[PDB]
Copies of this chain bind each other. A is one copy, B any other.
Amino acid sequence: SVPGSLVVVGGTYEPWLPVLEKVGWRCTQVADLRKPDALFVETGPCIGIVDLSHDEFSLNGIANLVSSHKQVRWLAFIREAQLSSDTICQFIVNFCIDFFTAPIPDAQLLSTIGHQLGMLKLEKKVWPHFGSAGNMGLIGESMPMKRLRDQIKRIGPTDVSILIYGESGTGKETVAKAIHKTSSRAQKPFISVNCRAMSEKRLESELFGLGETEEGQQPFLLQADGGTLLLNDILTLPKSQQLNLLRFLQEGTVETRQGVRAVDVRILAANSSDIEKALIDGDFNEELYHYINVLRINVPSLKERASDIVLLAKHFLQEYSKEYNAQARSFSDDAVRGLTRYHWPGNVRELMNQIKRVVLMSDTVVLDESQLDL
């Protein structure tokens, strides 16, 4: 087991270190601050002691390293010596739940840490080897994609709502399917809604049946009883519609043809636009936002996914060549470089769609360079 890692140019502050080691835990300290930034991510969830007897290293960047997407993937911990530091003690606004005194009980500080160390041992115990496969990862396998799966697993099971904000065609629907399998309600229904063009009329027929409800009609939430309902591009939700989603959020009740009935649905969302501007402006209700933004997940873009662009092309060829019986089976080597350079605004989707176009053009078995430049 390799969790537990303090960070300071000191490290010689061992009136508490071998006490953690002699109990059989070891330790891994950090000096500079450019290094743990790359460590805390890869390590995922761990206990990190930030020793601050002033000790030379900052306070602004100290607050940054704690929050720079290291919130959920790190349980915070701090250390100082009598140094009450009444001023910027506001650093404990970031749930550094317990400090570290100088009259240390070199055995009962283990009572605090050990309960927190035993708190982290909860997570990895029921899955101590998931990090490679994970049912193929469902898309790719890079640095931020290995990162993505590590988050997906520790945010899956908890039947809370999750905000999925990423670029267009990053696979918000793909991610929603992924965590659904881990949500223990996997078998139960899954519903994806392209809320972009719902245009109030039918979008409200789903919840409170307006001046028409054909026969069954059966609400999108009615079918999604024991399962999961997803709403993509949630910022495209009209004002009077956000309330009804907020209604089901605050009550858990939708109207069907054979009477109004309450259900229990884990509702997920998917964001495309800048979420901050939409809130200040008042496009979207912020009280509903806090319900969805319980936990955030960033779906990596292709610009952030270098050593992985190539894999997405090899396996997309397969499903598409087999589908349409094309006489091609590989790109040329120059076509490999030509794809890892493209902006990929549509990300996976554009690489997906454009490749499908190519397949239905080429007469050759190997895909050259010139034809697909646009």
Contacts and interface: CB of A to CB of B under 8 A. Distances in A.
A151 B281 CA distance: 13
A47 to B, nearest CB: 11
A342 to B, nearest CB: 11
Interface string A110-144: 01100110110011011000000000000000011
A158 B95 CA distance: 12
B298 A159 contact: no
Interface string A142-166: 0110011001001101111100000
Interface residues of A, number: 89
A140 to B, nearest CB: 13
Interface string A323-353: 0000000000000000000010000000000
A97 B68 contact: no
Contacts of A56: 262
A64 B64 CA distance: 24
Interface in A52-103: 56-64, 66-69, 71-72, 75, 85-95, 97-99
Interface of A: 32-34, 37, 56-64, 66-69, 71-72, 75, 85-95, 97-99, 111-112, 115-116, 118-119, 122-123, 125-126, 143-144, 147-148, 151, 154-155, 157-161, 183-185, 249-252, 262, 264-267, 274, 276-277, 279-282, 286, 290-291, 293-300, 303-304, 343
